[PDB]
Amino acid sequence: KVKRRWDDDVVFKNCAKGVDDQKKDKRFVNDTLRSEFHKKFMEKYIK
Amino acid sequence: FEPLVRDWNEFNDINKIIIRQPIRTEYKIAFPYLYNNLPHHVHLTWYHT
Amino acid sequence: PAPHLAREFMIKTRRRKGL
Amino acid sequence: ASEMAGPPQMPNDFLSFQDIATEAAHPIRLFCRYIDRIHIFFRFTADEARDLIQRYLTEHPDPNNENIVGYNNKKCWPRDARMRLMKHDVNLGRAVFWDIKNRLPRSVTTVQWENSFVSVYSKDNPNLLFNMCGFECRILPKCRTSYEEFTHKDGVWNLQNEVTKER
């Protein structure tokens, strides 16, 4: 029996090859609500 | 008194030590620099009167 | 205890140094 | 998923399979999903592990041995009981995570290395640590590095092998 290797069957594969730790959080936006320190604060503290 | 100021080490590896007599605070105060790292604001008192 | 002081002595001394 | 849930005329129970062939026919041996928390248990052979790590490195190459840095363990057990980050181990941990996080489109849900936790058991790590409903557990078998065993304060469940009935 030739087989199919385990995890080959699954419906999806690499979702984003390019993304390799680029800085969305390490650019300085001078906006109070849309800055990436605020995005971190909000997602840590609200649920 | 209230404490003055407030991860891994190798010399503290428990496979490399020999505890024949266990260190105590009397020793750590008798020899401040031999028996203590970062001994700061320390007086070295000794007397063989 | 005394039967093993040199046994340990070797193990720990090489463990630091002798490998 | 259909091997785990068993044939519709004869479902299985929580973590059972039908025979041993089907159970050992795949790396994913157990799977529980609390409301949106995911606990998976894989068991790899030497070559499954080697190929997984190959295809991991091919895409996310770590020539500078910096895989060891991100790895997060449990600083609540002593270092005698935490996880030991050898190259093969942390690379398997990351390959497994990289392979699971690829099955999930990013528009649906995702999975983050910062909130997750992977723990390998090998010939270097005898402890398997995990973290379930509210508990922080660590399994240590008797065959592996327990020359010394006690039976002591109750914090220690003594798991038992229900075929041979020996701890």
Next chain:
Amino acid sequence: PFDHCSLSLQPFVYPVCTPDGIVFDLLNIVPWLKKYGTNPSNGEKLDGRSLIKLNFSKNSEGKYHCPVLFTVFTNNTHIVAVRTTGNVYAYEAVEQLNIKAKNFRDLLTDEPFSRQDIITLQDPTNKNTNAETRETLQELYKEFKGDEILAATMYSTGKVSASFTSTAMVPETT
């Protein structure tokens, strides 16, 4: 450690050291040079014929010792290598047996050696998923054509003030 590769940082069953001093496991260093001719020890590309082989001895235990002294070579012992002979004898061995005397010959055989042919190699003192989807996307890219309603429907003026005291707008800054 001692006898593991460096780019893999894993063990090397057959070693080929670098002319600089580390272990470049030839089986994958040839893949590294046949896919990107550079070196991992130094990101600069280095020529081929420099990767000579090495001889790590072995005892009744098989450990990669030094043959001359019978000294087990681990991450503490100082290891020198002799290039031209193909043999590696312990650095202390070679030193006190040739850097006392003036017989600058080999360390395993009867062969001479060059006064710079010994280099320190180790020294701690230094979507086709189903027919439903295929036929779906076929019929979609076939029968599907551009849209109408939401196609259309997607001092100063005030867009600045609006978009600033309302997050539910696209930010203009002018």
Next chain:
Amino acid sequence: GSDQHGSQFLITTGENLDYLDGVHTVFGEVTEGMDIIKKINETFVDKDFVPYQDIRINHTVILDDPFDDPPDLLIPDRSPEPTREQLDSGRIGADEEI
């Protein structure tokens, strides 16, 4: 198994089958009948991967042979006709409209 090939052969409904490189002996490529291959792709199989409904190898014609026949090679004149053991599938023969 054991690098040994007989007459068992596979034909590829997908791409990038790297796990076979070094296991299975690449020797050909089909340029006609891949529509048939997409059909064979689309048939409904048991969890055996075995179709419910039959697909059969009805004839074979040598469009080009440069290999000489070994002497012993008894090539037969006509089809030895399909007997019951080979024909009755225990399954659905392609003829029966469902």
Next chain:
Amino acid sequence: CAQQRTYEKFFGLLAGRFCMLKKEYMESFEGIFKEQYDTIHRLETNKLRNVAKMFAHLLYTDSLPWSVLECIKLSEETTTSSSRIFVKIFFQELCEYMGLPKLNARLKDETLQPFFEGLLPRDNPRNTRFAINFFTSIGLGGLTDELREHLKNTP
């Protein structure tokens, strides 16, 4: 501990620690096992279960010496059914605690067979049949068939 909700090795471990801290409780526990073998019928099945598990914890921690088995005569007419259930739970605790192999090994070593004789009958064949049938019952076929092997060879 005997009056506890259920067995928890707390009380075992505690009195055993006292035994570890001096001999008074070691010989005291010699008599303590003796006395629960004397008055073991006196409880219900619940209490007897925690009792057996108690002495079992003692044993595989070796706080009691495997010697005490002398007071265990495995004849039918000497064995109260209460004793039978007691030693049932007891040896199940021993094997499922220690693993079966070294249980067989220690239950084999001859230096303790003087005590063990009352448990493993070769001398009297009637209680041989009976007691080996009881080791069958609790399912330690190893011990069972080894000694009824010897009794096979005997006549």
Next chain:
Amino acid sequence: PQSDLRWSKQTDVGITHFRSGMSHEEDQLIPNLYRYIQPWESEFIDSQRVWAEYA
């Protein structure tokens, strides 16, 4: 229970000393909730046997 900070973060050393809990007026021996609750691992064995024999 307190144990030797250094090797406590290293290798599970044991229990040498006993710091004190809250301060009670004398000896006074105040009981504990933990001793009136029953551990899990023992409930799970009870329930095993209890429902087995009810079946």
Next chain:
Amino acid sequence: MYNGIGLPTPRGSGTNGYVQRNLSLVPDILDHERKRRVELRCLELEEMMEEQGYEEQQIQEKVATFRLMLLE
């Protein structure tokens, strides 16, 4: 002795921080040296010969028998 036990300061801890110690705490070998027997057998013989005459022929006489008569 604050031997690394206790609190830094029992101030905001709800205890007096008092500490105590857990009271319930407890084959050439013979041939190689045969030539060493043969060794002083030649040495002291020519010595006990030179003690009684050192012409080196009277002593080479004494040694040769001490060598041959022994090695037989």
Next chain:
Amino acid sequence: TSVIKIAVEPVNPSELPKMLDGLRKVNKSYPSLTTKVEESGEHVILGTGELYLDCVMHDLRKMYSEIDIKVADPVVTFCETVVETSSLKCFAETPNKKNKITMIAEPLEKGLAEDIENEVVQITWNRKKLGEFFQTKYDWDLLAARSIWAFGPDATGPNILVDDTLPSEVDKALLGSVKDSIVQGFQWGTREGPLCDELIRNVKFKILDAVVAQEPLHRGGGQIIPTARRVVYSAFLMATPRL
């Protein structure tokens, strides 16, 4: 006798060269405080007493260099020896299989090693004076005195390399060729220790079989010393290590 062992490290490895400057300055300002950069990569100090090492580190951290530095616990420097004679032989032959060396080991008596330490037995004498000394005091053999080649570790080392195998011994061409390298390898093994890399003491090694390659040329000359120290180890480790 300096006997106390103290390993030292900076907290951040970055300032290790400054820590090295400090260890220089203490080594120069102190008579017998002896520092070594040990093969494990470490910096060990060998010293006399508690007060000694205390004021050592007092000055080290106070004046010479002001980094923060970690300090291990005190231990000893060790010694190695035997209890009884090497009952059999393992004999080493050069890499190029040219020289077979059979030697064994045994214990000396303490007194004579003491004299070796006393400079009382200074072999700067002639072998004649060696013999007077030895046979006079401790019933040594005169031929044993003839057989004593050297002393091992250094100028005063309590062990002795002896050569006693008469008919092959009178091969003074090839042996009197090889004595130099022989002594190099002997003192090598004695200093570097067979077990734990600390000094051996008060032990007797005896060469009983020297099968020398004829013309023991640079082949011998070079590949002879590790062979010799392996003979030393074979004797010692074979039949009776001790600490």
